[PDB]
């Protein structure tokens, strides 16, 4: 029975919910398991970055988030072809590669090319044969000063261009923004029917001739 004043609250406890209860008493006992296997991995890959392969720079969908930038899954084969890295040899120098990505824009394609250049330049490569250097391989002076980088590699930081204070022109003060929004919204909500009404204005006024 309801009291005087309160909520109409629906509790979702009409199933045998006591059987499928999940308690988190092992949460501290799994944070140590993950951290332990994270340092067994950061010790198995000795000088290689501890976070893993480098990830690309990636906008987000969904206008809620389409102004932040993120770290994707891999570098599209377009960006690898522009940077000049074989798609089957990229995965062996810690470059991430997923083929599913497209590149519609260019401002991001060149951002990821500049990203591969900035990585293939910071990359210290060890020679396949230890006792004998090779051609495409960092010289023995680096390898002794080669450390294991912690955290993500080349971390991705949302930046904003600093725009200095201008002086407002009489073309900027002339711009009625709200009218421009309500007009572009009308001229878009009505574009189809306007074009059809004008196809009728042009299909009738021709009959008068013949």
Partner 1 sequence: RMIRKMKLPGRENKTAVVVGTVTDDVRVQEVPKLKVCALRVTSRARSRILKAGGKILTFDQLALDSPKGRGTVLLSGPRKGREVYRHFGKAPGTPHSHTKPYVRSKGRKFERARGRRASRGYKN
Partner 2 sequence: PSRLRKTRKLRGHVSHGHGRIGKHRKHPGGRGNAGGMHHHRINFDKYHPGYFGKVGMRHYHLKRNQSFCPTVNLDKLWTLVSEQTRVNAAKNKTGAAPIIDVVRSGYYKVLGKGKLPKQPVIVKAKFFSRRAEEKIKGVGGACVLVA
Shortest approach of partner 1 to residue 10 CB, angstroms? 8
Query: Applying CB under 8 A, does 181 fall inside the site for partner 2?
Result: yes
**Are the CB atoms for 151 and 51 separated by under 8 Å?**
yes
| CA-based nearest residue to 56, from 87, 105, 100, 95 | 95
Which of 106, 210 has the CB closer to RNA?
A: 106
Query: Applying CB under 7 A, does 92 fall inside the site for RNA?
Result: no
Interface map 5-24 toward partner 2 (x if CB under 8 A): xx-x-xx-------------
Question: Among 40, 168, 177, 179, which residue interacts with RNA (rule: CB under 7 A)?
Answer: 179
CA angle 5, 8, 14 (to 5 degrees): 135
Shortest approach of RNA to residue 198 CB, angstroms? 9
| CA-based nearest residue to 161, from 107, 118, 199 | 107
The dihedral through the CA atoms of 65, 68, 71, 76 has a sign that is positive
Query: Applying CB under 8 A, does 67 fall inside the site for partner 2?
Result: yes
Cα(129)–Cα(112) distance, integer angstroms: 31
Query: Applying CB under 8 A, does 8 fall inside the site for partner 1?
Result: yes
46 binds, among partner 2, Mg ion, partner 1, none (CB under 5 to 8 A by kind): none
């Amino acid at each position: 029975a309801p009291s005087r004043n309160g909520m109409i609250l629906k509790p979702h406890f009409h199933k045998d919910w006591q059987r499928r209860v999940a308690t988190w008493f092992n949460q501290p006992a799994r944070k140590i398991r993950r951290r332990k296997a994270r340092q067994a991995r950061a010790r198995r890959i000795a000088p290689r970055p501890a976070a893993g392969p480098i990830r690309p720079i990636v906008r987000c969908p969904t206008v809620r988030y389409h102004t932040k930038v993120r770290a994707g899954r891999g570098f599209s084969l377009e960006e690898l072809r522009v940077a000049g890295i074989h798609k089957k040899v990229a995965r062996t120098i810690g470059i991430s590669v997923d083929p599913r990505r497209r590149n519609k824009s260019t401002e991001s394609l060149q951002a990821n090319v500049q990203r591969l250049k900035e990585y293939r330049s910071k990359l210290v490569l060890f020679p396949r044969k230890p006792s004998a250097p090779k051609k495409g391989d960092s010289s023995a002076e680096e390898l002794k000063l080669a450390t294991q980088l912690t955290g993500p590699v080349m971390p991705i930081r949302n930046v904003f261009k600093k725009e200095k204070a201008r002086v407002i022109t009489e073309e900027e003060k002339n711009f009625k923004a709200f009218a421009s929004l309500r007009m572009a919204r009308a001229n878009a909500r009505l574009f189809g029917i306007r074009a059809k009404r004008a196809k009728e204005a042009a299909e009738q006024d021709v009959e008068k001739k013949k």
